[PDB]
Amino acid sequence: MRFDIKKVLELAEKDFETAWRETRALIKDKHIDNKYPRLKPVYGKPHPVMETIERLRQAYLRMGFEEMINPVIVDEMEIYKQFGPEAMAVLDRCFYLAGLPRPDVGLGNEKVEIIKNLGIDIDEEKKERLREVLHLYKKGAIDGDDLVFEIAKALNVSNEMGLKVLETAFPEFKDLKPESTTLTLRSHMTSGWFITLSSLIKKRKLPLKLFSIDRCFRREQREDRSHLMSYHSASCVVVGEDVSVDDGKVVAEGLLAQFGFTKFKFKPDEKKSKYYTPETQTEVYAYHPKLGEWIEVATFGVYSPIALAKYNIDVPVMNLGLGVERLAMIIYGYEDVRAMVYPQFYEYRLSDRDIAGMIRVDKVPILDEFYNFANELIDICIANKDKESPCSVEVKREFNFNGERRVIKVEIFENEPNKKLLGPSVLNEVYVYDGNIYGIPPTFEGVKEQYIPILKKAKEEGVSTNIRYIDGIIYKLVAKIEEALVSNVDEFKFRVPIVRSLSDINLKIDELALKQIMGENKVIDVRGPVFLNAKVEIK
Amino acid sequence: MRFDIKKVLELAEKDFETAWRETRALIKDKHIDNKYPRLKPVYGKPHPVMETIERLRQAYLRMGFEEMINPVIVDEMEIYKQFGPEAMAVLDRCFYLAGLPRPDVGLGNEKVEIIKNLGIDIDEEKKERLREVLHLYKKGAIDGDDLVFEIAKALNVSNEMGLKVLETAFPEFKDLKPESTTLTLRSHMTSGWFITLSSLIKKRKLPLKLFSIDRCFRREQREDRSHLMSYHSASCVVVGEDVSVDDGKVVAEGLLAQFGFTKFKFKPDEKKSKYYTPETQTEVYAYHPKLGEWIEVATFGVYSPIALAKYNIDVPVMNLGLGVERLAMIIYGYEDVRAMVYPQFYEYRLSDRDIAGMIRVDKVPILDEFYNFANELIDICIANKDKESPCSVEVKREFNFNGERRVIKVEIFENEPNKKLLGPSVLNEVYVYDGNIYGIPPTFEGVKEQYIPILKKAKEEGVSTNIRYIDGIIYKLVAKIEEALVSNVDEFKFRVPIVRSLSDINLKIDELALKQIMGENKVIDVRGPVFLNAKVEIK
Amino acid sequence: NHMRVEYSKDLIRKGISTISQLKKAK
Amino acid sequence: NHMRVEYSKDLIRKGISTISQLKKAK
Ligand SMILES: Nc1ncnc2c1ncn2[C@@H]1O[C@H](COP(=O)(O)OP(=O)(O)OP(=O)(O)O)[C@@H](O)[C@H]1O
Ligand SMILES: Nc1ncnc2c1ncn2[C@@H]1O[C@H](COP(=O)(O)OP(=O)(O)OP(=O)(O)O)[C@@H](O)[C@H]1O
């Protein structure tokens, strides 16, 4: 359990130094299962696009901007107001919203028969209750969520039978086709900004500095290295009598400065979109190092007095919109938005450490007694690994299991002469380097010489499992002692000659790590002569 | 063992609704150990003072202020520079810094003797090596950190014995007494601001808005509900040709506004500290609802041209300092800073939920087989709890343990007439309410009528363990079957007459929760007649 | 560890096997 | 759960007890 405070204090007062040294034994090492690097840290991991969104919220807030949420869904005529006649072309880029009608369907008599053939007992009453539920669904008074519930309730059947009725008796529901409206999703924040400002200016003291960082949707040819069907705009508007394009320049500098950028460039936007005053629509470029090229991070301009007029705004307004995903690409060094935004549809490679922590000890003794017995036994072997043969090393110990004592005589030996007790590889340690697994000896005596610079490099740069051959071997041995005791076996022999695989030293690897090791076509080279012979007797 | 995708898809494709209902069995319920509320959420918990510090950094950053770190340690003469002659009084509140000298000690034969008597073999060489280590320590070239190491290294002894030599041969080290200096800890940010500003003004374009939120130290008579020896100042300075107290007023308003405050008060500071221009030192008050009274959150003013002059600053400077702990007291509703700041030295009461999650099931079967057997058995009893006596309920089941079959006949009965199989309390459920534990029946027939409004209230407002008597009872029974098999026992009877304690239904409570249950003088009332007789035979 | 739990359950079951066959041996 | 782990270890040990004394019976 825990340790004796009194005994520790007394031992320490007799002689502090001995006590400090000796008292280390009161601190147990962890179960082999849970030693580093098999012990992994757990922490929450943010998404780059969303951390960039928060950092942008704060870059705007720290410039005095007031945070807003604008309408997402806007009528097409809003886009005609802002873009003018150009909207008959620009509206190609916007998603229209469409939706299913309600079905007008009735009950009886063929349907009544279907429902009866389902095993349902229907009154006239039940038939009317359901006739009403269907009416209400036609008239829009019941949600789709709720229709299985209401049917079930109507006929007094199970929920699932409600669904059964729905799909069996009324399959014409499947013939509903979505019909489009005049409503669209905003393709940039502006489509909302006008609506928000039109209502807001008259109520507020100018100048206004507003911002919103929120989703926008474009209907594009395809998705790109730098384009998605849905993106995030880090948009703002500055409203005031004296506003000009320079305000956009200053907002772009202030946003980018806070992210570390010292160099960006402005460049006229050939499009000259009509919601912007002529010759004010400006592109902002920042440098993407991994791509080598300059990338468009933002766009700004001053709204056209014509659009502003159509929204009852009589004062100039500067707009700036920065694409969150672009900035994020630069920040985190991604070269493909699709792979940055949705990394789940791509691959998750395991590092040397990841793999080193997926290498586990197979059989280990379950009982504390024998686990410690194992550790001690390991240290014993490591102490006599060089005994000159013929050798033997006995360990007799008594274990008490309630009433009965059993005495375990584990003996590990070497009959044949001119040998040593254990062999050149018993202390080999399993490393992982560059996707490879190597069981490496502490010194390269007798190692083939092409191999040595590789193993030296893995031993230097790679990640260790901190498991030696001897460790897994002995845990296997003592686990076999436990196994023996519950199996009514009094004697057995156990031997590890030349080690050829992970299995041979009682280790295994998580299948996910194997799949990669193979897939990347790398090696698991665990090998060595480890001639360990043991006999155990259980009296 | 996961579930069969192919079998599922096929079952679902035959008849979706049946399949949807039936496949619930493929979602295994959790081990009783890990069912809510014994399963607790785990998350990191911020400290109110530090969370308030961060929110304050952001309140300052969002006003355009530039964040700084100022010197913490300042010479007393700095305080005379700022406070003028008043510093001969004000310096009372400041901590002086002191430190103990290096000892001048030599070796020589009396000590050499001690070191030998310690068991250490000392050469002339070792003696000279240690003579140097002691020299270097006098001359300040060895850190205290490092001295036990160096001593050991000198004498070629263990680390711990380096320490032993240190404390045994040179105990005069203990006679070192601390000598004071002229250095003090800052008692407010101002003591740093001047220094910082003196260096910074010449290098920068005015106006400057700087802020720092960092520790300050005062020597108070004693610590208060609202005073600690060390506190955090959320200080700032506004530097510019046109600053006046009004800048302090807007900084105080802007800080407090962002925290939700719509209401604060200004009040002249009777002190008229001399580092502030006359009649500008202002106190800021905010309302502490729980205390009922108005509390001082901040202080501001304009530095005195005399103090500014002594720092080579020729332009007015407004300073404001808000005490973080005060603001935190208001925000989180604490009435005692010492208890808000250092809550570990106070008490941690366990909520009803806390205690309900510290009620554990004692014995539960280890083998999946018997665990499920147990659940099945529970449902069987709950199904036959009302069988009219004489009753009996057999459950014969055969279990396979590698080679051998064993057949377990669990029989649950009631020989005596005019009763039922189980009894009125068998489905009672354990609740926690207002620090109390109650085992409560689903209905209040036969309950003394004094009790009923209480138990009704606990059942409505309290927190349930979601364990019924029958649950713990049966887990105990089957656990005993397991014990039996391992113990070579083929028959036993098992009976639960009237329930009197938690133990009677195989439950126990965490020691920490009991300590409170007792300390707070509350009850653990679980009792009921649950007459369950069972016989178990193992063939 | 999920593997350990099952190993220990394995030890338990073979202990019961051995007990059963040691019974019907006698 | 640590309590469970110790219970299962208990089951294992008493299984070994029962085996040992079933041996010295025969
Ligand atoms: N599909 C998209 N994915 C991510 N960000 C976009 C997308 N479309 C536009 N943006 C962002 O919005 C801003 C304005 O888009 P704009 O159309 O002016 O330039 P573009 O990159 O040529 O786009 P488009 O392909 O629609 O012409 C850009 O700075 C970019 O940050
Ligand atoms: N000991 C302290 N603990 C916590 N906050 C303090 C402490 N001393 C001062 N403060 C904060 O610093 C500001 C200025 O302190 P000031 O000494 O002017 O007022 P006070 O509360 O009377 O302090 P004191 O009584 O220690 O002189 C206060 O608004 C308070 O927020």
Measured distance CA(A105)–CA(B51) in Å, rounded = 59
Measured distance CA(B524)–CA(B508) in Å, rounded = 11
- Decide: B166 and B130 in contact? Cβ < 8 Å: no
CB-CB: which of C12, C17, C23 is closest to B488? C23
Q: DSSP letter string over chain C?
A: -HHHHHHHHHHHHHHHHHHHHHHHH-
Task: Give, as one character, the DSSP assignment of residue A142.
Answer: S
- Decide: A536 and A491 in contact? Cβ < 8 Å: yes
Measured distance CA(A345)–CA(B42) in Å, rounded = 30
Phi and psi, residue B144, nearest 5°: -65, -45
Lining residues, ligand 1, CB within 6 Å: A 218, 220, 227-228, 231, 296, 298-299, 321, 323, 325-326
Task: Give, as one character, the DSSP assignment of residue B232.
Answer: E
CA distances from B437 to A32, B466, B472 (A): 41, 13, 16
CB-CB under 8 Å, A368 with D13: no
- Decide: A81 and A310 in contact? Cβ < 8 Å: yes
Q: B366 CB near a chain C CB, below 8 Å? A: yes
Instruction: Choose the mutation target among B13, B14, B17, B61 for the interface with A, i.e. most A CBs under 10 Å.
Output: B17
- The region that residue D15 occupies, defined by phi over 0 for left and psi between -120 and 50 for alpha, beta otherwise, is alpha
CA distances from B358 to A428, B29, B351, B517, D22 (A): 46, 20, 11, 12, 40
Three-state secondary structure string covering A293-311: CEEEEEEEEEECHHHHHCC
CA distances from A286 to A211, A339, A341 (A): 21, 20, 20
Which one of the ligands is nearest to B321 CA? 2
Angle at CA of residue A390, ends A384 and A392, nearest 5°: 50
Rounded to the nearest whole angstrom, what is the distance from the C-alpha of residue B493 to the centroid of ligand 1?
78
Measured distance CA(B234)–CA(B87) in Å, rounded = 23
Token pair, residue A83, equals: 């873009």
- Decide: A329 and A288 in contact? Cβ < 8 Å: yes
Report the nearest-CA residue for atom 15 of ligand 2. B299
Q: B487 CB near a chain D CB, below 8 Å? A: yes
Measured distance CA(B337)–CA(B295) in Å, rounded = 13
Measured distance CA(A118)–CA(A108) in Å, rounded = 15
Angle at CA of residue B200, ends B197 and B202, nearest 5°: 115
Bridge partner residues of B213 (DSSP):
B234
CA of A483: which chain C residue's CA is closest?
C11
Measured distance CA(B294)–CA(B282) in Å, rounded = 15
DSSP-based three-state secondary structure for B504: helix
- Decide: A295 and A285 in contact? Cβ < 8 Å: yes
Rounded to the nearest whole angstrom, what is the distance from the C-alpha of residue A80 to the centroid of ligand 2?
61
Pick the closest to residue A406 from A366, A368, A370, A378 (CA basis).
A370
Token pair, residue A418, equals: 């001119």
Atom of ligand 2 lying closest to residue B218 CA: 1
Measured distance CA(B477)–CA(B536) in Å, rounded = 9
Q: DSSP letter string over B268-294?
A: E-TT--TTB-TT--EEEEEE-TTT-SE
Rounded to the nearest whole angstrom, what is the distance from the C-alpha of residue A427 to the centroid of ligand 1?
60
- Decide: B526 and B437 in contact? Cβ < 8 Å: yes
Q: A403 CB near a chain D CB, below 8 Å? A: yes
User: B: neighbours with 3+ CB pairs under 8 Å?
Assistant: A, C, D
Neighbours of B527 (CB within 10 A): 17
Alpha helices in B139-284 (DSSP H): 147-155, 159-169, 190-200, 245-257
Token pair, residue D21, equals: 């004394």
Measured distance CA(B157)–CA(B163) in Å, rounded = 10
- Sheet strands side by side (includes B264-268): B66-67, B208-217, B230-239, B317-323, B294-302, B282-287, B264-268
- Decide: B85 and B135 in contact? Cβ < 8 Å: no
Pick the closest to residue A423 from A477, A389, A386 (CA basis).
A386
How was this one solved?
A: X-ray
Single-letter code of the amino acid located at B471: D
Is ligand 2 within 6 A of the CB of residue B321? Answer: yes
Which one of the ligands is nearest to A252 CA? 1
Report the nearest-CA residue for atom 31 of ligand 2. B323
Pick the closest to residue B481 from B394, B395, B374, B362 (CA basis).
B374
Q: B128 CB near a chain D CB, below 8 Å? A: no
Measured CB to CB, residues of chain D less than 8 Å from chain C are 5, 8-9, 11-12, 15-16, 18-19, 22-23, 25-26
Pick the closest to residue A248 from A270, A218, A274, A269 (CA basis).
A269
Q: DSSP letter string over A359-406?
A: EEE----SSHHHHHHHHHHHHHHHHSTTPBSSEEEEEEEEEEETTEEE
Neighbours of B126 (CB within 10 A): 17
Measured distance CA(D14)–CA(A403) in Å, rounded = 9
Measured distance CA(B252)–CA(B248) in Å, rounded = 6
CB-CB: which of C9, C16, C21 is closest to B486? C16
The tally of CA atoms less than 13 A away on the side-chain side of residue B271 is: 15
- Cβ burial, residue B460 (10 Å; 0-12/13-18/19+): exposed
Measured distance CA(A474)–CA(A431) in Å, rounded = 19
Neighbours of B128 (CB within 10 A): 12
CA distances from A315 to A191, A208, A210, A277, B521 (A): 18, 11, 15, 13, 71
Phi and psi, residue B511, nearest 5°: -55, -40
Residues 20-49 of A with CB under 8 A from C: 33-34
- Cβ burial, residue A278 (10 Å; 0-12/13-18/19+): exposed
Distance of residue B164 Cα from the nearest chain A Cα, in angstroms: 7
Distance of CA B226 to the CA centre of its chain: 22
Pick the closest to residue A133 from A170, A158, A175, A160 (CA basis).
A170
- Decide: B226 and B180 in contact? Cβ < 8 Å: no
CA trace torsion B76, B77, B80, B81 (10° rounding): -130
- Decide: B509 and B524 in contact? Cβ < 8 Å: yes
CA distances from B529 to A230, B478, C18 (A): 65, 21, 41
CB-CB under 8 Å, A33 with C7: no
Which one of the ligands is nearest to A324 CA? 1
- Decide: A14 and A23 in contact? Cβ < 8 Å: no
Measured distance CA(B214)–CA(A47) in Å, rounded = 31
CB-CB under 8 Å, D18 with B486: yes
- Decide: B422 and B454 in contact? Cβ < 8 Å: no
Pick the closest to residue A484 from A391, A393, A408 (CA basis).
A408
- Decide: A493 and A507 in contact? Cβ < 8 Å: no
| Number of residues assigned to chain D | 26
Instruction: Choose the mutation target among B40, B404, B478, B486 for the interface with D, i.e. most D CBs under 10 Å.
Output: B486
Distance of CA A103 to the CA centre of its chain: 42
Q: DSSP letter string over D1-26?
A: -HHHHHHHHHHHHHHHHHHHHHHHH-
Atom of ligand 1 lying closest to residue A298 CA: 29
CA of B367: which chain C residue's CA is closest?
C9
DSSP-based three-state secondary structure for B302: strand
Distance of residue D1 Cα from the nearest chain A Cα, in angstroms: 15
CB-CB under 8 Å, A404 with D20: yes
Is ligand 2 within 6 A of the CB of residue B423? Answer: no
- Decide: A532 and A426 in contact? Cβ < 8 Å: yes
Phi and psi, residue A146, nearest 5°: -100, 0
Q: A487 CB near a chain C CB, below 8 Å? A: yes
B/e letters for A288-322, b = 16+ CB within 10 Å, e = fewer, are beebeeebebbbbbbbbeebbebbebebbbbbbbb
DSSP-based three-state secondary structure for A187: coil
Distance of CA A31 to the CA centre of its chain: 28
CA distances from B61 to A58, B54, B67, B211, B243 (A): 9, 10, 8, 9, 19
Measured CB to CB, residues of chain B less than 8 Å from chain A are 16-18, 20-21, 58, 61-62, 64, 158, 160-161, 163-164, 167
Residue with token string 């025969």: D26
Token pair, residue A299, equals: 């766009």
CB-CB under 8 Å, D13 with A403: no
- Decide: A69 and A235 in contact? Cβ < 8 Å: no
CA of B402: which chain A residue's CA is closest?
A487
Whether the link from the prior residue into A37 is cis, omega within 30° of 0, is yes
**Rg of chain D over all Cα atoms, to the nearest angstrom:** 12
Instruction: Choose the mutation target among C10, C12, C16, C22 for the interface with B, i.e. most B CBs under 10 Å.
Output: C16
Task: Give, as one character, the DSSP assignment of residue B202.
Answer: G
Which residues of chain A have a CB within 8 Å of the CB of C1?
33-34
Which one of the ligands is nearest to A337 CA? 1
Report the nearest-CA residue for atom 12 of ligand 2. B323
CA torsion sign, B278 to B281 to B282 to B288?
A: negative
- Decide: B221 and B294 in contact? Cβ < 8 Å: no
Residue with token string 């010197």: B71
Pick the closest to residue A192 from A158, A166, A217 (CA basis).
A217
Is ligand 2 within 6 A of the CB of residue B186? Answer: no
End-to-end CA distance of chain C: 38
Structural element, H or E, at residue A232: strand A230-239
Rounded to the nearest whole angstrom, what is the distance from the C-alpha of residue B227 to the centroid of ligand 2?
7
Which residues of chain D have a CB within 8 Å of the CB of C8?
5, 8-9, 12
Distance of residue A164 Cα from the nearest chain B Cα, in angstroms: 6
Distance of CA A264 to the CA centre of its chain: 33
Pick the closest to residue B256 from B215, B228, B295 (CA basis).
B295
- Decide: A411 and A533 in contact? Cβ < 8 Å: no
Measured distance CA(A131)–CA(B122) in Å, rounded = 106
Which one of the ligands is nearest to A328 CA? 1
Token pair, residue B375, equals: 């659940």
B/e letters for B421-437, b = 16+ CB within 10 Å, e = fewer, are bbbbbbbbbbbbbebbb
Which residues of chain B have a CB within 8 Å of the CB of D7?
363-364, 366
Contacts of B476 (CB under 8 A, 6+ apart): B362, B363, B494, B506
Which residues of chain D have a CB within 8 Å of the CB of A368?
9
Distance of residue B403 Cα from the nearest chain C Cα, in angstroms: 7
The count of CB pairs under 8 A between chains C and D is: 34
- Decide: B299 and B321 in contact? Cβ < 8 Å: yes
